[PDB]
Design a protein around this ligand. Structure first.
Ligand code: CL
Ligand code: CL
Lengths: 328, 323, 328, 323
């Protein structure tokens, strides 16, 4: 270990890894808007996640509009989130560009602004094979050794699922402490990737299947990721505590409740179609849940079949009732 | 300003020349600007009609902004007004593209060769809104629409082309030709002569003979291997020498057949930056270094295909430059 | 066989299999309207169709019983009475059953076989060549039309396969894709070097025929059973090099058929081509048929409406070009 | 029928169709080794297999003649002699041929049908339900195992189709995908609410049995013909809730089979699974069989080696646990 390296390890990734959206002002869908981040809501939201018991906070994944925020907006938003968290929990800043050098340059500045790590996708103009994927993450880790890294394994967004041999290599990179994974959406690969990282990387399933992997692999699968904490974090923190207590019957009933709340999200049950518009559908979910306030999404992802927003709003309202139940 | 009428003949697309350490993530500026100038001047003197920079194989993805603006400025200055210059500008969102497009126009580019954000795919409505936004924000810039289904996660719809043909700034589209045969003809009908739809150099003769009033231009990503084969193809089409066009077309397809690993189109697209770079090196018409991070990994045998294609084309360049 | 590539010229018409009103019931032992089949085949001869083909995809090659296929083919062959070549569509799950069906259809008087390939697993080019060579060697008295249908048979037939298929004497034509796969059409065309007739679409024929007049002397049409007059006229226009007329007619054909594809979605039409085409044949009123056979009976009603509207539009074209010989 | 979901417990073994040495010749009219068919089926009973099924994908349902399929199923049925339920695999291109095959198969003594669906056009969820309802109604004396193979039949059965299928008493079980489609396995599982046995793979049965001990009380295995002892032993460990042992043995089964997928590519294996599995059955030595039937005889030779290695690795596990 070097005094410059990140102090965070796989052991610090435990419990709920919450991913928040980037709150937006009412003119956020206009190309002429110079600055579209609602910074008051951002700070209140970040603080709400700490007080609600989120264990790790991440920003600006896909639905966080990593793609469409300006660099000025990304910096200001992350700095506001970091100041609001005040070091109480680790903060991973979502930084994904079209190439290795811009990602490195953004990652250094985000560390300067006090983020503890980076939630990093990968360039997607062309797909990267496994050798290309490992070289990218190693490049980022060597250039910014002071940042921990959460690997963004999103096959649709980045044009490919990260291979098991790539995970084995990623787990030798000390900065890599976690990966946002697919859970049962890629069930066989999740277990293959799990063996490949040998407890050196925390592989994060979904809130809707964390219990299944946690029971089967209690020593390894000790955290999940959730993009629904901004609808209210209480259903997921409670799942964390049910798992910790090994109340498997209670875990199953809560898990059924979460999937039930989210079922309307996918238009006509079509998951590939939800991914086509995940930014727009999630935004209507966050609005409807009423736990945070936000405006429209940013250019260019403003156009969506109106009926798809119906599924988002129902899912938000469904989750609101869960939040209210478990907020006690 | 530029209109559809200004896009005729060979629309050449050049790569971005690179210095020997271009493949290192710690290299801050990787463009060989002397080569960029020499290459652009060579395209003008070799008969290229319209010059475009920084599409996919131009490494629009992996250049830094400082690299892109300094490369565009050098190309525009070396061209010195002789032919139109379209700066390739493509980012992950509308607002960075507009901001890049404004500065690129301020640096003297005549237009923008624009692809669209692809983190999420855009539907026909989101695609039309993106190009309208750009055109309204940079009204002085003509626009070449970048229809690349694999890069941008979907083929631009015929209804989308219908709307794009109502935006005056949209003067041309880099299209797929026979790789999307039905769409090309459907799109060509939707734009109704208001947009120049550019097929491939290997497809151009077929579409020009069938639609001589509308398909009066193609694009070529091979001009940096030597533009003489394609400018010759242009003159043969203008003269309506269909036998000679067919024979030259077979020569062009013959030269490039090794570009595709096992003939597989889709494998080539996954590595088109790496494979094209090897072709430019071997053709020897220009010099360049390796590719930029992150696109430095590629099955070695795919590079052999690009090199042999580049050597094959260099032979065509020598044959047709002596006319 | 006596047939060669030279015998494949003009309009290769593919017809559906006419059905009785109870054809959609699984308890219907025999569902072919044999009277209408004979009327249909005769009208194809009388209307100028140059080659007749039966039981492709929309002809329900999959869902007819073996007894239905034998009887339908016998009726068609007898009504054609040697006036034009007849290719019986025979496609099963394996080489041996296809060979068995091929020999029997030859005994009932068909001149050749319109053959797709086994589809349970995809065949690679070696497997594709072996299959057709097997069929050709076991039934050498039957000419062959290769059914190149990527969706049905799980892949596009490769250009090296076409090179090998062009050394088999029985192989005289291929039902191809035209501009739906334009680069491959021209690759396959070079490969066969005039030994196989590569049949594009009726909407594509003019383009390929103008560019390659010595080779692309024929197309296939699955619309003849709505009335063959527009397609045979297109043949006559191409033979007269009336290119402006060819372009105008091609537009009229594509125009009549635009409502075939729901919301313009070609892929969605292909999931229900049997059901939609059946609606088209009914509405066009050139032939009479009942419903489709099990298992292909379920379809959104909206998709049927688009097929019927296509049928009515083609009927107007049939009325126009059928009377162009005698009118004003 | 008297068979219900309650009778589908333990190892559901799927066996291939033994072939004679000239089985790969299209002029061979009858290619089944019936003596080997009888010996294997008996060996499956004596080895602890709880349910036997024939003529799925690797059993070459596609490429056997009807006369072959009858004779093979009859021979298996006679050899089993009522000891365990036998599901005859019948999948044709249409409803009526499947039904008529299915009636004959019940007349030859099969207890039910292992049925995949017509695949020339893909069937949507309503067409899937109608197909299986039609078969169930035409031959109500026959229990049915639904064959959920998305590659073979052009689509994963939708969860709404499973909800409806679970109202058809004849439908007792489905050959499923386990962690290959884990999210859907669970959705389908909730939808059937214990009225249909959803069969995961032998390599993830332990995971699903531990989580759902009262529902997922059976798996399917396509490796029983390499020796059924490793899989019946897994059944016993699962019943005994010996989870540590279950995990280690699950790892052993995965380890023995890894050589099967060319360079770890599952989709590549599926393109040649009949050919590759054939190599594995020969190598394991538990049964003898000739080559595959037309048209699935072409396959890269290295893929076969990967199947041969898997056979030998499995034969070591068989010897270990047949102890
Ligand atoms: Cl002409
Ligand atoms: Cl337990």
């Amino acid at each position: 270990m070097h005094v410059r390296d990140t102090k965070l390890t796989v052991d610090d990734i435990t419990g709920v890894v919450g991913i928040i959206p980037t709150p937006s002002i009412p003119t956020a869908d206009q190309p002429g808007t110079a600055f579209s981040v609602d910074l008051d809501e951002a700070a209140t939201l970040a603080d709400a996640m700490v007080r609600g018991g989120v264990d790790v906070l991440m920003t600006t994944g896909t639905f966080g509009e990593c793609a469409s925020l300006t660099w000025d907006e990304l910096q200001s938003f992350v700095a506001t989130v970091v100041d609001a968290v005040a070091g109480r929990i680790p903060v991973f800043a979502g930084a994904t560009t079209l190439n290795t050098r811009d990602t490195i340059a953004r990652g250094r500045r985000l560390g300067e602004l006090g983020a503890d790590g980076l939630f990093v996708g990968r360039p997607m103009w062309l797909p990267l094979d496994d050798a290309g994927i490992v070289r990218f993450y190693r490049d980022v880790a060597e250039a910014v050794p002071n940042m921990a890294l959460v690997v963004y394994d999103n096959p649709g967004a980045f044009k490919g699922k990260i291979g098991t041999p790539a995970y084995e290599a990623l787990s030798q990179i000390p900065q890599v402490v976690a990966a946002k994974h697919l859970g049962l959406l890629s069930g066989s690969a999740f277990l293959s990737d799990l063996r490949a990282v040998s407890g050196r990387v925390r592989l994060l399933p979904l809130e809707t299947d964390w219990y299944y992997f946690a029971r089967l692999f209690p020593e390894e699968v000790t955290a999940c990721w959730s993009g629904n904490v901004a609808c209210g974090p209480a259903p997921v923190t409670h799942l964390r505590d049910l798992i910790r207590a090994r109340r498997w019957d209670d875990c199953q009933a809560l898990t059924d409740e979460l999937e039930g709340a989210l079922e309307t999200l996918y238009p006509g049950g079509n998951f590939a179609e939800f991914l086509k518009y995940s930014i727009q559908i999630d935004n209507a979910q966050f609005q409807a849940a009423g736990f945070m306030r936000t405006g429209p999404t940013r250019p260019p992802y403003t156009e969506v079949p109106e009926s798809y927003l119906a599924g988002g709003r129902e899912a938000g309202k469904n989750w609101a009732a869960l939040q209210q139940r478990y907020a006690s």
